[PDB]
Design a protein around this ligand. Structure first.
Ligand SMILES: [Ca+2]
Ligand SMILES: [Ca+2]
Length: 704
């Protein structure tokens, strides 16, 4: 019913007599082309008088016959079928032969000076050979072909015999409206596109669009400006990318969830009758950005848990029974992650699993055209309700083993890191088809044909506000040296943040989910930095935060915006926070006992804590660390209710702390990721000696 509702003829309704001032652009499913004044609340009363109209599209017939076309105002109408004039400023009985299976272009013009009624009552009729006259049915009428090229059956542009609205890029939105501003509103389920009128639309909370009249897609993506704003688009496209100035494209990385390491079989020896020795660790994977930088590459970095998971757990090699001359195997569970704004249907990108700088251990591919589901934006493949992908799947005889020699295994143990480099080959695009009003995967449309143009013509902003993960958006922005890109509207930094990331402005302060813009930092590549510095000098402005509405974005800018609470590594991953931030986040304790601490810790702060150290201090100052090992600091868990429990029993032989004198102190320290030790020291010290830690709790026994 949604698909059907958006098919039919396309109409342009003008306040002036000569097709210059479009007030409404909208389609009609039938030959009833009326718009009653009841549906015009977003149009000034003065402009609700329509002195002209043009309709365009196609007509198909179910049965070959002679037809006679009629309107409700033939004295005011000229109509064309293909190039043949069939009505002209008077009624008539002239017949026209139409064959079944063929498509005929329809153009109708209407002009009436000084109508006494607002809106337009207008119907298109035909009469067949059996003299039965009827308003043209929905099954017979189709939209114009508002694409960059013609189809086999449907011409892209209309007859020049009749008048034409200026629409240089053939998206359907008149030149003037794209430049001056327009909005869309639904009234009784129809989408009306109208000129932006500030003193009506602003307070109704309608969205002001501007777009290039020379770019069918102003963001250089595969969906037209008209398709976006009228909902004639893949429903999987992100809400923000329904704006003509926000690019719709996939962005993919691979998330590794866990890893399992084992000894490889060798020809010289035969597997014994015994349970295979494996070491199994959770992994944490983040999409990275190396700075902003220019690189548009997809990469994620995997951190392998360095903490114990099993009581009396031995070293990796002892656990695997891996000796110096042996080879190790790796398996892992993964999912693909789409952090972009458009879906993938039939080609997942190839990924390299890399040890160190450039030792490729594995190539990970999916079968083209055999995906089990769509990889939607803000989502995963497989979906999180389904099992992940194993790199070597059960009974997959064709899955290549992933092996490391002994020295590579030592390198993996030393770094506890892997990298997943993913290409940008994403396959075919689901596009809208004006002939049937459907969205389907289009064998003729491919992401590789638009990604470079998106990357060349937009400003990139990378923002970590949602959950400290790096999210990229691209916003259409002028390139002063490229005439086609200078036809685009001005884009301010403030506006880009609103439209691309959903910043809002309730009390005249720009914020994201309750956090003021000043709680995030700004970083730019070298060229972007110089550009903005120059803009600020021209504005006589010394603080970027107070003039975000005046800083203009340009194509090929790179802007990185991060939560100021955190310390970041070279990949722009959050790895710590200042001492006082950490201390403050642990200040409110709900309960303390000899079994542990229960408290409420902000979810973002928790992401940069790797461990806690528990210590008993005597009345003379000697300190005993209870969990005195670099791999025994994983004592924090998040409960069902979102509270954090720091467990004193876990590495105290499952017993509450014994406090042999109530004036003794229990001190607890937090260790941030930045400061986390992941191996014994050079001299083999496995203790917590020298670990840079932050005191977050200290109480005497009688206080607990
Ligand atoms: Ca246009
Ligand atoms: Ca356009």
């Amino acid at each position: 019913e949604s698909e059907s509702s958006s098919q039919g003829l396309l109409g342009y309704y003008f306040s002036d007599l000569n097709f210059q001032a479009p007030m409404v652009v909208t389609s009609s499913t039938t030959g009833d082309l009326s718009i009653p004044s009841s549906e015009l609340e977003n149009i000034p009363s003065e402009n609700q008088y329509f002195q002209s109209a043009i309709w365009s599209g196609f007509i198909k017939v179910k049965k070959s016959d002679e037809y006679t076309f009629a309107t409700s105002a033939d004295n005011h109408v000229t109509m064309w079928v293909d190039d043949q004039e069939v009505i002209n400023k008077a009624s008539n009985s002239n017949k026209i032969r139409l064959e079944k299976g063929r498509l005929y272009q329809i153009k109708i013009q209407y002009q009436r000076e000084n109508p006494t009624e607002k809106g337009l009552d207008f119907k298109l009729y035909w009469t067949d050979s059996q003299n039965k006259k009827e308003v043209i049915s929905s099954d017979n009428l189709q939209l114009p072909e508002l694409k960059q090229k013609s189809s086999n059956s449907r011409k892209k542009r209309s007859t020049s015999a009749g008048p034409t609205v200026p629409d240089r890029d053939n998206d359907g939105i008149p030149d003037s409206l794209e430049v001056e501003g327009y909005t869309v509103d639904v009234k009784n389920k129809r989408t009306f596109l109208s000129p932006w009128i500030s003193n009506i639309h602003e307070k109704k909370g309608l969205t002001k669009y501007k777009s290039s009249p020379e770019k069918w897609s102003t963001a250089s993506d595969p969906y037209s400006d008209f398709e976006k704003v009228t909902g004639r688009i893949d429903k999987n496209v992100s809400p923000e990318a329904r704006h003509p100035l926000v690019a719709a494209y996939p962005i993919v990385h691979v998330d590794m969830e866990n890893i399992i390491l084992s000894k490889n079989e060798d020809q010289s020896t035969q597997n014994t009758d015994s349970q295979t020795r494996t070491i199994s660790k959770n992994t944490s994977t983040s999409r990275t950005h190396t700075s902003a930088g220019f690189s548009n590459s997809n990469s994620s970095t995997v951190a392998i848990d360095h903490s114990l998971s099993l009581a009396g757990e031995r070293t990796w090699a002892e656990t695997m029974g891996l000796n110096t001359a042996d080879t190790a195997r790796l398996n892992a569970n993964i999912r693909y992650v789409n952090t972009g704004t458009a879906p993938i249907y039939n080609v997942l990108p190839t990924t390299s699993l890399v040890l160190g700088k450039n030792q490729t251990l594995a190539t990970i591919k999916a079968k083209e055209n055999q995906l089990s589901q769509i990889l939607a934006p803000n989502n995963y493949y497989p979906s999180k309700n389904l099992a992940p992908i194993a790199l070597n799947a059960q009974d997959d005889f064709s899955s290549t083993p992933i092996t490391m020699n002994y020295n590579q295994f030592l390198e993996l143990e030393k770094t506890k890191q892997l990298r997943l480099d993913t290409d940008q080959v994403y396959g075919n695009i689901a596009t809208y088809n004006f002939e049937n009003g459907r969205v389907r995967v289009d064998t003729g449309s491919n992401w590789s044909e638009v990604l470079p143009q998106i990357q060349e013509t937009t400003a990139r902003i990378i923002f970590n506000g949602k959950d400290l993960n790096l999210v990229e958006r691209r916003i259409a922005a002028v390139n002063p040296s490229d005439p086609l890109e200078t036809t685009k509207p001005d884009m301010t930094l403030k506006e880009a943040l609103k439209i691309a990331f959903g910043f809002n402005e309730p009390n005249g302060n720009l914020q994201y989910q309750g956090k003021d813009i000043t709680e995030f930092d700004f970083n730019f590549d070298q060229q972007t930095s110089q550009n903005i510095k120059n803009q600020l000098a021209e504005l006589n402005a010394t603080n970027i935060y107070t003039v975000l509405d005046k800083i203009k974005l340009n194509a090929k800018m790179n802007i990185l915006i991060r939560d100021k609470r955190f310390h970041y590594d070279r990949n722009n991953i959050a790895v710590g926070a200042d001492e006082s931030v950490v201390k403050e986040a642990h200040r409110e304790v709900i309960n303390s006992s000899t079994e542990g601490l229960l408290l409420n810790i902000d979810k973002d702060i928790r992401k940069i804590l790797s461990g806690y150290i528990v210590e008993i201090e005597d009345t003379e100052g000697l300190k005993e660390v209870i969990n005195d090992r670099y791999d025994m600091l994983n004592i924090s868990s998040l409960r069902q209710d979102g509270k954090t429990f720091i467990d004193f029993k876990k590495y105290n032989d499952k017993l509450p702390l014994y406090i042999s004198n109530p004036n003794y102190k229990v001190n607890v320290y937090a260790v941030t990721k930045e400061n986390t030790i992941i191996n014994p020291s050079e001299n083999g010290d496995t203790s917590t000696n020298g670990i840079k830690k932050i005191l977050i709790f200290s109480k005497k026994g009688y206080e607990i």
